[PDB]
Amino acid sequence: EDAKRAAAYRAVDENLKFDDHKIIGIGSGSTVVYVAERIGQYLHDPKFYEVASKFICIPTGFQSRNLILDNKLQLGSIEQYPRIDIAFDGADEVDENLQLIKGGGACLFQEKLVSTSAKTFIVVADSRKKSPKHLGKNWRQGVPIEIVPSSYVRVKNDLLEQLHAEKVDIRQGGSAKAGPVVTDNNNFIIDADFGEISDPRKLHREIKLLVGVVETGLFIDNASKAYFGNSDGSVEVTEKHHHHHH
Amino acid sequence: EDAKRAAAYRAVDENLKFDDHKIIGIGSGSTVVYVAERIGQYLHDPKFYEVASKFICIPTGFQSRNLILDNKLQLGSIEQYPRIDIAFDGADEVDENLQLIKGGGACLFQEKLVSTSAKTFIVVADSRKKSPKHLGKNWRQGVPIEIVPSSYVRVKNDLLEQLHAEKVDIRQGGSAKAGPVVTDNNNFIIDADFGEISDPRKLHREIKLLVGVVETGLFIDNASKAYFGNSDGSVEVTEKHHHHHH
Amino acid sequence: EDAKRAAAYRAVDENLKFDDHKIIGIGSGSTVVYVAERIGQYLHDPKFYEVASKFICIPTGFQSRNLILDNKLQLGSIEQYPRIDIAFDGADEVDENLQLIKGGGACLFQEKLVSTSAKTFIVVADSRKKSPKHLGKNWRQGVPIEIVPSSYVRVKNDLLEQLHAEKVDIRQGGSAKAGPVVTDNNNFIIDADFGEISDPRKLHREIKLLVGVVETGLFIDNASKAYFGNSDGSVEVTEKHHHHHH
Amino acid sequence: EDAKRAAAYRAVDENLKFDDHKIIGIGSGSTVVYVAERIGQYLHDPKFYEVASKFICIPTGFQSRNLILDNKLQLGSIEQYPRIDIAFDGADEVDENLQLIKGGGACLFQEKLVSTSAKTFIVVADSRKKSPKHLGKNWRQGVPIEIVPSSYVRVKNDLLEQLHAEKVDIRQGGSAKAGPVVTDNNNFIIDADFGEISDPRKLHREIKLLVGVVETGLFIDNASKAYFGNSDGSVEVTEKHHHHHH
């Protein structure tokens, strides 16, 4: 939690341009908590209250919608505000090229609709999310894939037989819900282990073309920067072209 | 698990009438596992295989659908088989009048559609489910209530303000899903604590009449018997009119 | 269309209180078009622009959401604005006691969630909607009933067998969609003919208690006034206690 | 209706192999009516009753499910029977290479899930469906595209801006439902006019990769034959490699 907040405040302070940005994407993170918190803080500041009052915040589902309202920020919809200025969100893993695995919380669809509608997309995470090189290195649970519910047998068959997935499960709802997770868009989630992914761009397209697949947890050529919090208060940043700094 | 299986085998053996019953409701239990198992066993028996081959099993959602198929039983739909002969299911709590709290797994709607379509409804549970007297005694988490998603503020307001609920939460999906649980019928779940419920019949009607409420986890005048497993291998049975035996 | 607009402008002018009302319910009408239009006109007026700029308009689904935006009014959600000051909507039929049949457009659920969240509810219609006495007199197509999709056989059976409905059909989608209409809340619609309905309050409760029923198109003790347009430009008003005037 | 039935009976008689085929896909046609009818007729025949009794018929949504049951055929689900032997369905237009436009009834998703799960796919239509050359020649209403509901602005923007669509509309529900059609999979439908489509394979992939797109009405390299009924009782057949005959 320590690390999570560190990354978030730097991400907002360095990238949110009070002169340029009005439509802000707020993601489904447990790290974004501190993004919404930071933005909320600017609204409590007499210096920025007037400009921050006018920010319209676009959610990526229910926790996100909640984080916005609870921070007293204006809540908009992506349908009314389709051109987003800047979006902040978490990630389940980030690779050396700022390709992401997302969807650990089953909200990958609206996360991607928002992030790919944004001029700038910023990821905020704790340092464990930063892979030595490839997606699928430390996030071992699979690429989340949102699917039409009637297709779960077909999609599982295709992922195994055509795409050579190593492991494919329809995500179940645990103690909160018996049987399959249903998303905010009324879909199922498959978690598909592909091992370490060397060509995530190619992998995404292959999964996306499948009959039954709604969207993948692979976010490709989208994030412009990722901020990673350390417990020790420090923050590392990954940018495009393999450039990284503290 | 011990206790759970004990109750299940007696429930089936004593109540499933191979001469009379063809359409069988199979519930969303973690105790029903052993009901489907028991029924499956009769199908592996040369004596009963021919009759049990012809059973059509009606599920109460995805685990249930799964338990049926995995036990090699014929799978039907409630729409095609609306008159069910006998249904078996679990319960989160059972009172002295065989009124039930159900919905701990968020499948209360299809559980009730099936159980109230059945001539006979049998509950199978471990002994912890058997209340000293009232619903809400040992199940402290609230009556599950399935609601239209846009209504969660309204329904919460009505439950608190009109019905004097003690605690009202929209169930969240835990680590499997960020934000609210979505059911198999695309709805939300509210868990509403009403304390110990002295008139569950009255309570059910009041909740059911609310704008936003789809169905309640209160199963009223439905169960004809409940079987309760003890670890010690013993099985207690509650029947109508406060009659109970081993 | 003539008549429809007449009723709408009087309804708004006489009932929208610029001093008292800020949260306005806008219904799913083809007559409400002219309600949203009228409200929009006040926003184009330098006298009222500042006050009308601050109105927050709560939709009852997609046409409604559209009418609001296209009239340049602020769009809110019922979840964020649960206490509505005044709501305007259409009706498929109105009886002498201002009980309504609604749901001809399959939006009855969100229509009722909004209208019953409002301090004041005003109906706007053309004169054909005004029954000589009872609901079911000139609207012959049935009471719309929103139902959980898996329950359509059960609900039809109950409506016929328990409630003695005269005719029960699951509404089909016509040329736009093969098979059953699916609502904005992912439900089916049954249209149930009960003939002329002498006790709509009793009828509503009976349908609402059924397993599978989400909400009914019977709006009971909700509307405080109804405005009816004539082609001839005239407007008749029905109020509580059988009082009617031009 | 005349023409529609002609095509259907020949399609079944020539392609349904009572020795080889057990799992049969039944489509969402208004022409398939006569396919299900024909199959049903074989079940009324003492010669074929025993073999046809064992056919399991996989539906492509509600009319289809209905056609199966009403013809007394066994009803299965694609999840339980994922490998389909032969599927029959209609089409909104067929080109010279047996590429199809489908989705006029908003059931394109489950139609494609079924047809692409089949070893053999046969189209049955009246002669108006047979384009002189290209898709989009006589079907002028657009390629149906199933989309996640929150994405309708984004998808419309992408179709116009990236793919140069000529016309893009979110399909509305007509008199049966105010606002957007919702499909059996809880999605919206966009009808996108691309004019006459010279490379439907390329077009399908481009639309399918879009954020918000669930599935397209472009069925590519799927149909092995198409039967076209004439009023005059005659039937024309298109096969692979531009081969056509009566």
Curated annotation (Swiss-Prot), chains A, B, C, D:
Reactions mediated catalytically: aldehydo-D-ribose 5-phosphate = D-ribulose 5-phosphate
The EC number(s) this enzyme carries: 5.3.1.6
Pathway(s) the chain acts in: Carbohydrate degradation; pentose phosphate pathway; D-ribose 5-phosphate from D-ribulose 5-phosphate (non-oxidative stage): step 1/1
Highest rank taxon of the organism: Eukaryota
Annotated keywords: Isomerase
Record keyword Transferase present: no
Pfam families per the UniProt record, alphabetical: Rib_5-P_isom_A
InterPro entries in UniProt: NagB/RpiA_transferase-like, Ribose5P_isomerase_type_A
Biological process according to GO: D-ribose metabolic process; pentose-phosphate shunt; pentose-phosphate shunt, non-oxidative branch; pyridoxine biosynthetic process
An example Gene Ontology CC term for this record: cytoplasm
GO molecular function, one term: ribose-5-phosphate isomerase activity
PANTHER family the UniProt entry points to: RIBOSE-5-PHOSPHATE ISOMERASE (PTHR11934:SF0)
Further remarks about this protein from its record: Present with 5680 molecules/cell in log phase SD medium.
UniProt family annotation: Belongs to the ribose 5-phosphate isomerase family.
Record's protein name: Ribose-5-phosphate isomerase
Top-level taxonomy: Eukaryota, Fungi, Dikarya, Ascomycota, Saccharomycotina
UniProt gene name: RKI1
